[PDB]
A paper describes a structure:
Finally, we obtained four crystals with 69%, 58%, 21% and 13% oxygen saturation, designated Crystals 1, 2, 3 and 4, respectively. Crystals 1 and 2 were prepared by the pre-soaking procedure, whereas Crystals 3 and 4 were prepared by the pre-processing procedure. The structures of Crystals 1, 2, 3 and 4 of OliHb were determined at 2.4, 2.7, 2.2 and 2.1 Å resolution, respectively. The average occupancies determined by the B-factor analysis (68%, 51%, 19% and 7.5%) turned out to be slightly lower than the oxygen saturation determined by microspectroscopic analysis for all four crystals. Besides the structural transitions around the heme pockets, the largest ternary-structural changes between the oxy and deoxy form in each subunit are observed in the AB loop region. In Crystal 1, the conformation of the AB loop of the A2 subunit matches that of the deoxy form, whereas the AB loops of the remaining three subunits shows the conformation of the oxy form [Fig. 3(c)]. In Crystals 2, 3 and 4 all of the AB loops show the deoxy conformation. These facts strongly suggest that the AB loop of the A2 subunit is most flexible and most readily transits from the oxy to the deoxy form in the early stages of oxygen dissociation. The side chains of these arginine residues are oriented towards the solvent region in Crystal 1, whereas in Crystals 2, 3 and 4 their orientations are shifted towards the space between His F8 and the heme. The bulky guanidino group would affect the coordination geometry between the heme iron and the proximal His F8, and may reduce the oxygen-binding affinity of the heme.
Here, intermediate forms of the 400 kDa giant Hb from the tubeworm Oligobrachia mashikoi are reported. To overcome the above problems without any artificial modifications to the protein or prosthetic groups, intermediate crystals of the giant Hb were prepared from fully oxygenated crystals by a soaking method. The oxygen saturation of each subunit was determined by occupancy refinement of the bound oxygen based on ambient temperature factors. The structures revealed that local ternary-structural changes are induced at an early stage of oxygen dissociation, and subsequent global ternary-structural changes and large quaternary-structural rearrangement might arise when about half of the oxygen molecules have dissociated from all of the subunits.
Author numbering:
A (entry chain B), B (entry chain B): 1 to 142
C (entry chain C), D (entry chain C): 1 to 147
E (entry chain A), F (entry chain A), G (entry chain A): 1 to 140
H (entry chain D), I (entry chain D), J (entry chain D): 1 to 145
Write the structure that this text describes.
Amino acid sequence: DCTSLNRLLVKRQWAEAYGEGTNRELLGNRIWEDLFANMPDARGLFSRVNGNDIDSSEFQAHSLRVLGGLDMCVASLDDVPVLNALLARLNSQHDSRGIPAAGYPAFVASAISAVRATVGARSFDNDAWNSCMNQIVSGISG
Amino acid sequence: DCTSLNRLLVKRQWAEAYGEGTNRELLGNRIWEDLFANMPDARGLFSRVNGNDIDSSEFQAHSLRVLGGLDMCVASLDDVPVLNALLARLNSQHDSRGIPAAGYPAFVASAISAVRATVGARSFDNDAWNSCMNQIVSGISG
Amino acid sequence: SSCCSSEDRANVMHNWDAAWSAAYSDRRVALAQAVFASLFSRDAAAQGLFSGVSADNPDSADFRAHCVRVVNGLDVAINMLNDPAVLNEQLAHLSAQHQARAGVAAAHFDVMAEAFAEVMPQVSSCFSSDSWNRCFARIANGISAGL
Amino acid sequence: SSCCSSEDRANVMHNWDAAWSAAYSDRRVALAQAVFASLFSRDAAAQGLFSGVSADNPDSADFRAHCVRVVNGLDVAINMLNDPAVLNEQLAHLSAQHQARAGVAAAHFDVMAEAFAEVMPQVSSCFSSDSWNRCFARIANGISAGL
Amino acid sequence: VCNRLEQILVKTQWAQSYGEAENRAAFSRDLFSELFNIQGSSRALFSGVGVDDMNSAAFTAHCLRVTGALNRLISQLDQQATINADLAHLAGQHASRNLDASNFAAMGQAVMSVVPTHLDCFNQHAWGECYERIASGISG
Amino acid sequence: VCNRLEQILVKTQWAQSYGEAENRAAFSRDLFSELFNIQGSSRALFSGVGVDDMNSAAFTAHCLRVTGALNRLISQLDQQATINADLAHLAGQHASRNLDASNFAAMGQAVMSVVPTHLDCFNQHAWGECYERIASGISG
Amino acid sequence: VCNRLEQILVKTQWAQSYGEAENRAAFSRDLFSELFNIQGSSRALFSGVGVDDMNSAAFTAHCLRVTGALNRLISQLDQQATINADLAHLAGQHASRNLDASNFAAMGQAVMSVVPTHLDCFNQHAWGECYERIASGISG
Amino acid sequence: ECCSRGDAEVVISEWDQVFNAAMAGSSESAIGVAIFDVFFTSSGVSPSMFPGGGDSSSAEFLAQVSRVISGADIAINSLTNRATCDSLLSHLNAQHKAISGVTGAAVTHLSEAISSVVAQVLPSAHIDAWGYCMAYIAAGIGAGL
Amino acid sequence: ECCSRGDAEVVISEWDQVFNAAMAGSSESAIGVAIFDVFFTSSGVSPSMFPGGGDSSSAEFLAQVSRVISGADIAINSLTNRATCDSLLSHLNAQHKAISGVTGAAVTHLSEAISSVVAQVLPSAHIDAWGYCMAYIAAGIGAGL
Amino acid sequence: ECCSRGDAEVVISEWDQVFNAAMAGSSESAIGVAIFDVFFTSSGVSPSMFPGGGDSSSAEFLAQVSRVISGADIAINSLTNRATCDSLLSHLNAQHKAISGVTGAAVTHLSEAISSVVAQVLPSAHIDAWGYCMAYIAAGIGAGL
Ligand code: HEM
Ligand code: HEM
Ligand code: HEM
Ligand code: HEM
Ligand code: HEM
Ligand code: HEM
Ligand code: HEM
Ligand code: HEM
Ligand code: HEM
Ligand code: HEM
Ligand SMILES: [Ca+2]
Ligand SMILES: [Ca+2]
Ligand SMILES: [Ca+2]
């Protein structure tokens, strides 16, 4: 359950990890290296944004789009009506792309792993992060 | 294609990553940990230079030999006649060792990954590095 | 032609990050709502372009999420001003998303620019209007290019 | 017996790295070519040992690549002077590769030493001849050991 | 009064001044120092909280309660029904003290004399509007 | 308005803020920056002095003339007949520009947004009184 | 003249002196300063590039073109056919100016007075050889 | 000592970590409601005695929650000066003495609810320092109750 | 160059030394009257053309004196940025072109009156830097006059 | 402003990154030929008008390429002092006015060819700063053409 207190911790640690400017690209890099290492068949879904070269401008812009999508949701975790409307649009933006359902739990793991590495394991709460990330991908996957 | 401009970038970033003295050993370490993690059956090819202990003097000297071989080639990328002659000797030095052809694309990936980690992902160009590394292993493998 | 300079970008990113609520959407909704109110006041027809997100009810979840998306779009672009190679890809993306929207024209981005130029001085401490106008142009011209 | 000392190694590595072209082979070919010319001038017979790499045509690709290999061999060894456990393995390797070469004898490394001692003062700024002679011995003795 | 955008500037600049202060006790004391300097008649209203020694624990405590009150109000400026309830509570804690409008205008000037000296950016008008919002809720 | 004691605080704090500023050009520009941020309609009044680029020499010059005007007035605040003459001169340089009272209130808020951010001590009321003294002399 | 090894020292020491200079404009100006100090008759040859004020943009520009010329030549010292072509181009840009050998010897002394003062290591002879290579290409 | 200077500085530091520049001024309400939820369970006290009856949808209670967090913020931020802190505690003690049914144990239960919620939102929290410094606060607020 | 950056910095420094924290805001009037006295002598210009007729007892002239010192303060304090300074000089040039009987020589005479009075009140003044930087100011104000 | 001091410093920094201690003095030729290749495509200008006819095997063109890169190096390294830079641009402008068939558009095409090749060899390059500072250079070299 992504509880009131879960949301607070996910909000605070997301804000610290996301950060400013090019440092957002650092976060994004951890995610996709981990994701494509674990699920290298997912890389082909990103052919239009040059998923074979994650350091390219095309993929870096996509990477930063995802992080912003994620930032919208974290920022809206306390406002479920706005949250649902954001996930609905995110859901349109992912449907009929042949995205395997296993890509989502795997993305969640890569994202949580990147955040943990940015803010520090000792400060970290896997339960709160898993509960709130699942509420987000449950709205997107489908 | 390892173009004129590709060669320039590979030259410049190789020079920055290779460096001096024991710091070359750092680069070499990234490569073989990654290579032997992905292809742990390749480790047996290095029995004579103690591939089971990559931190030993025997393997460290071999590691530094490879990096120098690589440095010769990067330095000669603009001089194809000299490049071919270097790859020919490198080719003699690898034949009839039972080296699987998959060891080469895997080595290229480990090497490019180590270089990227030394010079920084944001400065990096995977296309240029893959094109020029392939011209090098195409001369060795066989 | 006046350019959004290196120093122009630092001012904008400073004004933006300092008025930014990193963890909560209330503030960025409030910023977008005053922006759209301004935009619709200058161009009463523009509002019809946003029927798909319930523009006639600015306090609805449906429109407040469109608010979050626009502000997010701007925040991402603003934060890419130090990596303009990346910024170009992102504006070409925003461009296509706005080409798919019947009625949206480059003229609307000028009204949008006036709406931000009116609202930012009211949320941003020590707001540099010149740096903003030039880097907002840099961003908005990239989105409105082709339409 | 005079030793290639910690301070001797720093001087050599400084002179070497400062005359080194990190990205291009032209310079290290030029260094090796003047070295071999010197070597062959002191020992006209030595040249016959390099028939396998077209020594009679010093401007050929075939010989210019042998030049890159020798210089590379030296650069690797010089750079290992701060990890002499590693250096020992590498010289024992160079040793065996030169044992497989009919005609090569330890006396040739003395002529080679004279050839570098003549050429380095012409490529290297502030060249420390004493530090070089002692650490070149340290390296060359390890290659010529056993032959 | 104190619209949704004016709240942003006030919340931010309250944070960069009060929320970044090295010594919240000194900051709170400076505020009542000014108020007294601005309106010497105001000082005797605080005979219950040891105003005679402004460095007393009793008076530092009062100063902290008030800047704490200021802080909890500025943070709920966007939550109209919460702050109205909280303002009405504060009004009831001041009603018996026979305060007048000059007292609240003096407090506001104290507020806006102290706050900008701990900032690089200050929006006078935004602050006047939102101080009026609070004072009007407290004065009744 | 602006009595003899209020003049002391204003003169001092003008000196410690404006008179100690590292970059008088930036300080003067910040003041008109605020004014525009406070009242966007004010900006077009300055089309004659290159307002379109606030970092132009033409516009920096204007900003310096005004803060220079502010400085020469604050220094003669105690010399009632001198400043009245000087204020009447400034009034004649503004009369043709069809300014209204909102323009002068905006300038005052700009003045009192910028000045305290360069101080440790600020007396709001003293400044309001003495800005009114100047604006009233200039507006007519 | 200027063999393959001498080129290495010159290229390196050009880089550590000219290529590491904080102020390439000053460096280039110092060079013509020396030349004039070494041969006062040389100065009037530069009446076309504002030599009268050595800190003029016009004269700093000339100085930058020349040290830029020096830089592009030293970098192509190993590419014999390229530099010969480039030297012949430079010779044609100097032929009309009726220069003599004392002018080129003075420039060389200027070159070798300025360059070592920005180094820890200097090879005089290597530099004399390779300056002669350039001057001989330019003088004809 | 019990809640030493080093204890206090950690509690203030971590309280401020919870209420950093991102979370300050937007998260107090969700924190305080969570604290009360924890408190109603452990104390068995009736929400009906509170303004708005404990109704986290009631503006009267949200403001009541706002005061409680603030008073905690104030007391905590004064932990480094114990003379000032004792006075703030005594004021709070007097305010609750005027209230029917506030017991010393319920006060302890509320102070501990603050620590436990802080630990839930800040897993690195030094729960011993919090235990020591909240018990000092709870003894001051609930003295003679 | 004529009134270099180092020249300007000295003039600004010494102008500020004259108008230090003690003297700023009380001595401008006595300075400016002294400057005009020096100026009327060297220029032969009529005090009657000035507001209050040059009467240092006249409030109209004291304010006129106040403007002149201020405009000098402004021009001087902008000596380090010559683009900004040229604009200020051009504004002053336009204002005096609107005035019957202002000559280039009288302008030079007034700029030099400022240097000489500064030297009288600040004996260490670098009269060469002042000479250079006041002539640059006088050429801007009196251009085409 | 267009190509501000901060813009210029980045362009100089990245130009120097391309021509670092390893690459300076060996890579100018391959860079310049790449720039011309890009330029011949975008401009449609004839290689025949250039020395050696655009033949990257021709020593006459390689030296021509060497001059062009140098002149760019010089102009770029002078971006921080715009008075000096304007003079260098004017000299280059005069040199190309003496040349039949150099147009303002072709000049823009060559300046942009430099940015794009720099970005190809330095992926982190700040292509906006380059765009601004190369257009300032192109306007100076191609003024009145
Ligand atoms: C929290 C989870 C995720 C978020 C917030 C997210 C966010 C986004 C956003 C904002 C876009 C841009 C939409 C547009 O403008 O077209 C996008 C595109 C896309 N995402 Fe996701 N994403 C998530 C998970 C995933 C996963 C798990 C996959 C596949 C493994 C995926 C695959 C894609 C693809 C294929 C696209 C379209 C790429 C293109 O533009 O060509 N996403 N995503
Ligand atoms: C760019 C690619 C490579 C370069 C530059 C390189 C370089 C070298 C060099 C210089 C040596 C020393 C030769 C000698 O003196 O005997 C060597 C030996 C060797 N390399 Fe490679 N190598 C490369 C790729 C690979 C790969 C992909 C493999 C296997 C996965 C491999 C396996 C070996 C083996 C088995 C030896 C002999 C080890 C021994 O001395 O016992 N190499 N290599
Ligand atoms: C800097 C300026 C702007 C930014 C950053 C921006 C950003 C965005 C974003 C992120 C979306 C969602 C795209 C999607 O999900 O397909 C969007 C949608 C849209 N935008 Fe903008 N926008 C800007 C200016 C404008 C202007 C000036 C107009 C018209 C006056 C406009 C009209 C629309 C419309 C009609 C939609 C689709 C509405 C809907 O989803 O139902 N945009 N914009
Ligand atoms: C510090 C001194 C030297 C170093 C670092 C060095 C290095 C090398 C290297 C790396 C090779 C290639 C080995 C292979 O690929 O099998 C080589 C080959 C060879 N070396 Fe040396 N060498 C040195 C001294 C000498 C001397 C003094 C001689 C004889 C005068 C010599 C004779 C040869 C010959 C004949 C070959 C094989 C030629 C060929 O490949 O056809 N070396 N050396
Ligand atoms: C408008 C902003 C104000 C705020 C936020 C504020 C806040 C407070 C607070 C928190 C208390 C302590 C209540 C308690 O917990 O017991 C208090 C008490 C008091 N306030 Fe204010 N106050 C304000 C304005 C004023 C003004 C304008 C005056 C008078 C000039 C004033 C006079 C008093 C007095 C006399 C007390 C009682 C002191 C005692 O206990 O003896 N307050 N105020
Ligand atoms: C109350 C304080 C003010 C002072 C001390 C002041 C001072 C000045 C000064 C020194 C000048 C230059 C006169 C000259 O030498 O030519 C000027 C011009 C001007 N002022 Fe003010 N001013 C004040 C208020 C205002 C206000 C409130 C506004 C409008 C919002 C305003 C609008 C203007 C305009 C439009 C000009 C003419 C610019 C031009 O030349 O085109 N001023 N002021
Ligand atoms: C040997 C090294 C020299 C180099 C690399 C060199 C380089 C240059 C360069 C690049 C130019 C500018 C051409 C252009 O783009 O318009 C130039 C012009 C000139 N050089 Fe040299 N030069 C050298 C020696 C000399 C000497 C020895 C003198 C006289 C003492 C001299 C006198 C001149 C003159 C008079 C001009 C023409 C200035 C004008 O435009 O009025 N140069 N030189
Ligand atoms: C650490 C422990 C506690 C803290 C920090 C705390 C803090 C506060 C504060 C700051 C106020 C507002 C006082 C005012 O301005 O009038 C308050 C009021 C109140 N508290 Fe507490 N409190 C604590 C424990 C308790 C407990 C344990 C109870 C119940 C058993 C309780 C019941 C109340 C009630 C009923 C009010 C008055 C509401 C009203 O009449 O407006 N408190 N408390
Ligand atoms: C360094 C030289 C000078 C400086 C810095 C200077 C400065 C000034 C300034 C700041 C003003 C006020 C402009 C305004 O606000 O309207 C002014 C006005 C005036 N100046 Fe000058 N001035 C200089 C030289 C002269 C000279 C040489 C004369 C006479 C020959 C002169 C005659 C006047 C007169 C008559 C006025 C106008 C008084 C009025 O109509 O209100 N000035 N000057
Ligand atoms: C950014 C733009 C450009 C730069 C930096 C540049 C730079 C240069 C330089 C430094 C020279 C050598 C001048 C000398 O020493 O005589 C030169 C010559 C020349 N340039 Fe350009 N140029 C540019 C654009 C162009 C364009 C667009 C064209 C053709 C349409 C062109 C055609 C030529 C030709 C034909 C010469 C003369 C070759 C000769 O007669 O020796 N340039 N340029
Ligand atoms: Ca301050
Ligand atoms: Ca300050
Ligand atoms: Ca020196």
